[PDB]
């Protein structure tokens, strides 16, 4: 390291929570893109969610959602051929897993693609709140959780990325290699620390968060 | 592999080159942001050039710059505590290298962060030109290259990224363990092929080019 890391100071008032894709279709073992390493993560985020809710901190769950017509997917239907039949509104599997059950004052954000703030309510709900801060968590790290953060600094929030609580998944060998979860986990950490904002634990920012409060 | 490869069809008309970052302050080993794999990527870019400028594909070039007094550093500053220093417009080393000169009929868009898309000129200019297809090259592949993808796909660009033509860097262990560029280029081009759009070699892209013009 030649640089320092960064870390953010918690004010509560400006800071949100963001739970990316916390969904049946990506949680349950049956669902059409179930991640395993979801499994470890939905207990650290039950804890932030109390934390948050109790510091009167802003939780905003992100939903992968589509009409399931194909009038809303172009790119996203060329990589992803059944994302109409499996994100569709109407099934079952897009609702938020119910160990993490939206509650009435949380937020709900829909999105069609990845990024949670590309074309969504995201921006306009964060800075109605005058939120600068935030804090993300679910799945896929490299993915919905990495294209949010990107998104994120590029709009001048102060991100901050948990180790313990964002999921990646195992790639097939398309050309360059078998890739586990464990490896896109260990350089997406490492490039968000080092190119767009805060890693730390969900225990950290959760007694950050109690003591700013 | 459970879903297939995408192939972009190229017509020469809607397609452009983005040549991202190939700046002196991250292609010399002077620099004060040296990536030494770049210098493997400078001849398949030549080629491809050389290539796109024959059949009449529009060559864009990125920089990353900004005015160098802090006016426009936010969170690129928290991260990069020097930038001002080092990107700043007056500075020599902003400048793309001579091995890629730009030519008058190219076009250069500036950038204060990484994304080639978000505020910057670059929606503008391909929309103008009627392009729906984008061939990325340059450097760093999973920082500027990689958010210039996900970018692109997610205003439904068909983004092409060329496998031997985007360079990664090394990081340091930041509590994750050690990084390798090789790890980092592996993991990128893996995600961006599952996820994102086309990889293919610069070859492949230049045969194509040449074929459809």
Known sequence: ??????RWPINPLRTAVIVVDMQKVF????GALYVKSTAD????????????????????????IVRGDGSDTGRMRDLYPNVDQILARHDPDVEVIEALAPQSDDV???????????????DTVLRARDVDTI??????TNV???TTIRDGVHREYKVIALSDANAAMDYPDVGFGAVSAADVQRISLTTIAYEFGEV????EVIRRIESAY
Chains 1, 2 share one sequence.
């Open 1 to 6: 390291m030649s640089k320092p890391l960064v």
């Open 135 to 140: 804090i993300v968590c679910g799945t896929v």
């Open 108 to 122: 709900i954000v829909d999105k069609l693609f990845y990024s949670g703030f590309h074309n969504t309510d995201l």
């Open 200 to 203: 730390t634990t969900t225990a």
């Open 144 to 146: 919905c959780c990495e």
């Open 27 to 30: 949680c349950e073992p049956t």
């Open 41 to 64: 993560i939905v207990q650290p985020i039950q804890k932030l969610l109390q934390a948050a809710r109790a510091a009167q901190v802003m939780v905003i769950y992100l939903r992968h």
